[PDB]
Design a protein around this ligand. Structure first.
Ligand code: SF4
Ligand SMILES: [Zn+2]
Ligand SMILES: [Zn+2]
Ligand SMILES: [Zn+2]
Lengths: 335, 698
């Protein structure tokens, strides 16, 4: 569904001592964690890692849905020293070369981790910006410390003229938060066009391994997925079958679809003196006063959470928990 | 916005009551206030009563006033849907408002008015007894051209293109449209010009509102109205000019002497008044401002002709050569110099009336006039008009001999500036005086005596977006003392200061503009700096304003700055606060987000002019040895402070060195004094806080 291109800054400016021990190692590690979370909340999505080193853009992880390739590609960067200077234009041109074969019904995202305060580009970057906006490519830049006007014009131009995507990071925790923000999709207002895709297989799991089989690598396996079209037994991933080009999805597509469908209804905070109901939680059992800062003014007040779709009481930890995972409110299942 | 609305109320009450007001506007947010306040103030009375007389110091402010005036026209025409009599006349440079010198001359010098006088004389000569007319003429005085402006705004650029399309000349359109009483946007060198202020004063016909914009260099303009340096070469040009006058005497006495006798009779009968009342569209000469001079009944050399004027003129220039060939140090009192001249030869105190008339007579007898000789005759004529009149505060001075070859110079020192500004307080009223680089605003009631009201800036909010720190400790506190001398001392300490500039420029690579008190430090650090990594890592290239500034060089440096900042590169702008181009166009990240100041501004001392004006102001206001090292430097530093402020939506930081800055005020007096190394990390945090508070305060 999504096609994100992770462009990490790997130049001499990354050798400075801001993060611990340096910016490069923390960006690599947090990039590995970003690969984990991204492939955990986006199963049938694509990733591609490019680095900006030695004044050039170097593709280190081809566009694929297997996280292990990105993990190894990120492990190879921390064993070398980030030298040279960053090149935004070359990275955006190569990102274009990786996002052009992507179908129009799939989003094209480019996430740039920019630590330096200056880039080294051959040609005019504004023409590359015009090319990015023309072919519809959403660009998000996580810059370090001071702002760059080129990043403002790029993030604003690549998002329907709206500026709210050039995120400034000031610490490791902030960078983690931005990473987390790139996991979640962005249902923007769009420009109203047509959408649909067709042909998505569902596999049958083969447990046989006495003679083994493989139609994508011709190697030994312990069992493999079955294509309902070309009838090939390949390595197991819910992505595209490489023998006739169609998906092999299962309950994962339903999972991410329902995750994108979650309304996440925050329960209204109503004091016990206003609800006139005993302290109760419907997901567990709560006899704990929430408020008690003062004497009888706060202890006898407390806070009861309310789901209005069923008029039920809950405590805060369960509102947070059902906001993180699970469908909202067990009381909405009983009528 | 309420802050600017308070200034709107102040402009309203001062326009309705007071005759003059000293209004202090915040830098970057006070240009669009008076432009609408004046128009609405004109509409509340009745549509056509007083007119906007906006006065700026540069042409960029004139263009900004024109485009903002167009924003006023669109603003008033998009909210009501009714079309009114449009105003707005752009009075710019003569070379930039003419089309013929770009077709054949291909020059942008100051002699375009001479060629325009050749074309005008061609028109007059093809309308009298006979070069071509020009490009297009004889239709610039008609009603249609007089109505092309009130029906549609055509100012400067729109007037240049409109004249290039409609086949017209913009000079006569503007000149004929000064009497139309539109919104004229000219500079201070035109309101107080000993050659332009007379005609403008006769065409505007007074009864308007004058707007002194950025009125902080008014004393500088009043000083620049005189002081002409006689550097021995003007004596040779005056000698060759006298020889040319003798040749012209032989020519008019050779065959055609009837016109000289007829014009001579016009002088004996109707004098200078009739001579200037008969001629129309003829080139004029210089004059010590006739409205300020007030001298009538100009007799033509005690009723004499031209041979006597060139004889007494040869004696006068020879006396000048005699007074310029002396020992070395000598000061002149203009009265004692006139008395000594009378002791050498009697000529009385009337060579002024003898120049203003004889120059016009020669013009009326000349058809092929040489430019250098006539120019030298105009210089000697001005010197005569200013040794014959205007003596109170005037001080003739001779430059000492310092080798003695490059030396014979004679400069005249002007008089009190209050005299020069004076006529506007009888011609006009409710003259609004606005400036964003005035602090304190008490040196304008003191120096230049006039009764007015004082209104200071009352706008100060969002202090977290206007980082204003100052640097005192440079790691050793040894460059802040050596950077205050007229001539630099200990070059190694200056090299250490430059190294501190390399470290500071490396810490904050996001557009840097550095201002220097003089070009000596720049030329000393640019010769051999022992370092260049800032140009090799963060700045790619450096921008240096030449000690001899050039228009195309400065333009290519500014465009190079905008393109360098629009490519994510940045460049250090090593400029001088005392140099050319004070700038004023910001409101963008293309300008230097961080501005560096090398100490405090300094004025060149050990000069006879600073001692003459020093003792003169000492006798006037008794502000001796105190205001010439804090007021002028305060204005020069405020010229750099005004570039940092560019609206509350933008941010910036300006680093001022030296502790002496605490002795002077500043715009937005919220400053913290700490070291420079600490200011590196402080600015490192400000470059993120300024980026975080934006979306939080919105
Ligand atoms: S009429 Fe106009 S174009 Fe011709 S010389 Fe005069 S100013 Fe220039
Ligand atoms: Zn298949
Ligand atoms: Zn609970
Ligand atoms: Zn519910």
């Amino acid at each position: 569904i999504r096609s994100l291109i992770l462009t990490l800054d790997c130049s001499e400016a990354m050798l400075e001592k801001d993060l611990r021990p340096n910016r490069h190692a923390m960006i690599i590690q947090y990039a590995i964690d970003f690969v984990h979370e991204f492939f955990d909340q986006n199963p049938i999505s694509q990733m591609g890692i490019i680095i900006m080193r030695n004044g050039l853009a170097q593709l280190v992880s081809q566009v694929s849905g297997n996280p292990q390739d990105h993990i190894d590609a990120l492990k190879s960067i921390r064993k070398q020293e980030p030298k040279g200077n960053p090149s935004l234009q070359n990275a955006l041109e190569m990102a274009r070369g990786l996002l052009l074969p992507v179908p129009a019904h799939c989003t094209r995202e480019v996430l740039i981790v920019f630590g330096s305060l200056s880039t080294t580009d051959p040609g005019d970057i504004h023409q590359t910006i015009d090319s990015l906006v023309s072919e519809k490519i959403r660009v998000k830049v996580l810059g370090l410390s001071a702002q760059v006007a080129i990043c403002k014009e790029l993030c604003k131009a690549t998002n329907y003229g709206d500026e709210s995507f050039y995120k400034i990071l000031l610490d490791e925790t902030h960078l983690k938060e931005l990473f987390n923000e790139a996991v979640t999709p962005x249902x923007x207002x769009x420009x109203x066009x047509x959408x649909x895709x067709x042909x998505x297989x569902x596999p049958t799991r083969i447990f046989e391994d006495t003679p083994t089989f493989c139609s994508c690598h011709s190697k030994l396996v312990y069992g493999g997925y079955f294509c309902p079209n070309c009838h090939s037994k390949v390595c197991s991933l819910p992505t595209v079958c490489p023998c006739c080009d169609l998906m092999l999805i299962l309950x994962x597509x339903x999972x991410x679809x329902x995750x994108x469908x979650x309304x996440x209804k925050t329960f209204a905070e109503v004091p016990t003196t206003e609800k006139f109901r005993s302290e109760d939680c419907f997901s567990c059992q709560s006899r704990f006063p929430x408020x008690x800062x003062x004497x009888x003014x706060x202890x006898x007040x407390x806070s009861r959470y309310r789901c209005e779709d069923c008029k039920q009481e809950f405590c805060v930890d369960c509102d947070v928990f059902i906001h993180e995972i699970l469908h909202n409110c067990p009381g909405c299942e009983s009528k | 916005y309420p802050e600017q609305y308070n200034y709107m109320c102040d402009i309203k009450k001062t326009l309705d009551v007071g005759g003059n007001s000293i209004l202090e506007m915040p830098s970057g947010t006070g240009k669009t206030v008076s432009l609408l306040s004046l128009t609405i103030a004109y509409q509340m009375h009745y549509p056509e009563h007083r007119k906007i007389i906006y006065c700026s110091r540069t042409m960029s402010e004139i263009e900004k006033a024109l485009v903002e005036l167009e924003n006023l026209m669109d603003y008033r025409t998009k909210e009501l849907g009714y079309q009114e009599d449009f105003r707005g006349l752009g009075l710019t440079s003569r070379k930039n408002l003419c089309l013929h010198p770009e077709v054949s001359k291909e020059r942008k010098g100051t002699v375009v008015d001479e060629k325009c006088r050749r074309m005008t004389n061609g028109q007059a000569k093809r309308k009298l007894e006979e070069v071509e007319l020009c490009e297009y003429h004889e239709n610039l005085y008609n009603i249609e051209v007089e109505d092309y402006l009130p029906k549609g705004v055509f100012s400067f650029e729109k007037l240049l293109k409109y004249c290039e399309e409609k086949t017209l000349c913009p000079y006569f359109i503007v000149r004929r449209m000064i009497s139309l009483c539109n919104i004229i946007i000219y500079s201070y060198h035109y309101l107080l010009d000993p050659k332009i202020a007379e005609r403008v004063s006769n065409e505007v016909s007074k009864d308007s509102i004058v707007i002194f914009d950025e009125a902080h260099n008014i004393d500088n303009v009043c000083i620049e109205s005189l002081s002409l340096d006689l550097t021995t070469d003007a004596l040779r040009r005056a000698t060759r000019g006298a020889n040319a006058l003798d040749e012209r005497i032989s020519e008019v006495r050779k065959v055609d002497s009837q016109k000289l006798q007829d014009e001579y009779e016009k002088l004996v009968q109707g004098l200078x008044x009739x001579x200037x009342x008969x001629x129309x569209x003829x080139x004029x000469x210089x004059x010590x401002x006739x409205x300020x001079x007030x001298x009538x009944x100009x007799x033509x050399x005690x009723x004499x002709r031209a041979e006597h004027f060139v004889s007494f003129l040869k004696r006068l220039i020879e006396y000048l050569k005699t007074r310029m060939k002396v020992l070395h140090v000598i000061s002149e009192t203009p009265k004692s110099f006139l008395q000594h001249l009378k002791q050498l030869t009697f000529i009385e105190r009337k060579p002024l009336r003898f120049c203003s008339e004889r120059l016009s007579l020669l013009v009326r007898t000349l058809e092929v006039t040489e430019v250098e000789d006539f120019t030298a005759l105009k210089d000697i004529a001005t010197f005569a008009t200013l040794i014959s009149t205007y003596e109170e505060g005037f001080l003739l001075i001779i430059e000492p001999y310092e080798i003695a070859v490059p030396n014979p110079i004679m400069r005249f020192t002007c008089l009190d500036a209050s005299i020069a500004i004076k006529p506007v307080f009888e011609r006009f009223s409710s003259v609004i005086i606005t400036s964003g680089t005035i602090s304190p605003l008490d040196m304008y009631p003191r120096m230049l005596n006039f009764k007015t009201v004082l209104q200071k800036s009352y706008a100060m909010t969002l202090a977290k977006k206007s980082f204003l720190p100052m640097i005192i400790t440079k790691g050793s506190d040894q460059v802040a003392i050596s950077s205050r001398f007229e001539i630099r001392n200990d070059p190694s300490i200056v090299r250490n200061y430059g190294s501190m500039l390399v470290e500071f420029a490396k810490i904050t690579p996001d557009g840097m503009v550095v201002f220097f008190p003089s070009y000596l430090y720049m030329e000393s650090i640019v010769s051999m700096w022992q370092t260049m990594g800032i140009l090799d890592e963060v700045w790619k290239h450096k921008l240096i304003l030449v000690e001899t500034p050039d228009a195309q060089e400065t333009s290519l440096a500014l465009e190079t700055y905008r393109k360098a900042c629009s490519n994510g590169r940045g460049a250090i702008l090593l400029s001088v606060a005392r140099g050319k181009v004070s700038e004023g166009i910001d409101f963008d990240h293309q300008y230097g987000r961080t501005v560096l100041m090398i100490g405090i501004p300094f004025q060149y001392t050990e000069s006879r002019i600073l001692k003459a004006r020093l003792e003169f102001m000492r006798e006037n206001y008794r502000i001796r040895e105190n205001d010439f090292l804090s007021f002028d430097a305060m204005r020069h530093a405020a010229q750099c402070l005004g570039r940092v402020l560019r609206g509350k939506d933008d941010y910036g930081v300006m680093v001022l060195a030296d502790r002496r800055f605490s002795r002077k005020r500043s715009q937005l007096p919220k400053w913290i004094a700490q070291g420079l190394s600490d200011a590196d990390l402080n600015l490192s945090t400000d470059m993120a806080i300024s980026n975080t508070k934006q979306f939080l305060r919105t």
